[PDB]
């Protein structure tokens, strides 16, 4: 339920081939850039990093919470069905 992770921006890459090591079943991988994620406060600084390094680009807007109008008296209504069946 904690949300102190949906506040920053990242610099993730696309995952490449990951093949098991012949001896002991590793995840031997030849993607040097795989295990790097950066942190960006906003996205316009994040995009600026893309331009200076000239990487391929696509973004995703923040999924802000639509404001759920909560209530407690609705759980005990007279006509509305919002009356809860268990408490």
């Amino acid at each position: 339920s904690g949300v102190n992770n949906t506040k920053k921006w990242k610099m993730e890459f696309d995952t490449r081939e990951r093949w098991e090591n012949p001896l002991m079943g590793w995840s031997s991988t030849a993607d040097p850039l795989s295990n790097l994620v950066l942190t960006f406060s906003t996205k316009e600084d994040a995009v600026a990093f893309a331009e200076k390094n000239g990487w391929s680009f696509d973004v995703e807007e923040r999924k802000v919470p639509k404001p759920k109008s909560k209530s407690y008296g609705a759980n005990f209504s007279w006509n509305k069905r919002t009356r809860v069946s268990t408490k």
Binding site: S77, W78, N79, R81, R83, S85
Partner: protein, 45 residues
């Protein structure tokens, strides 16, 4: 009629049948006003 000091007049609480509460509840229906309607007959409905 005279005021008493050592007489218990609640002998009926001993002589109450197993269904006595329900035996008085069943015919209580005649003194009933139209019960309020919630716009339906159950919240799931």
């Amino acid at each position: 009629e005279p005021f008493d000091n050592s007489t218990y007049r609640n002998l009926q609480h001993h002589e109450y049948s197993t269904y006595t509460f329900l035996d008085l509840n069943v015919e209580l229906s005649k003194f009933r006003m139209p019960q309020p309607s919630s716009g339906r007959q159950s919240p799931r409905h």
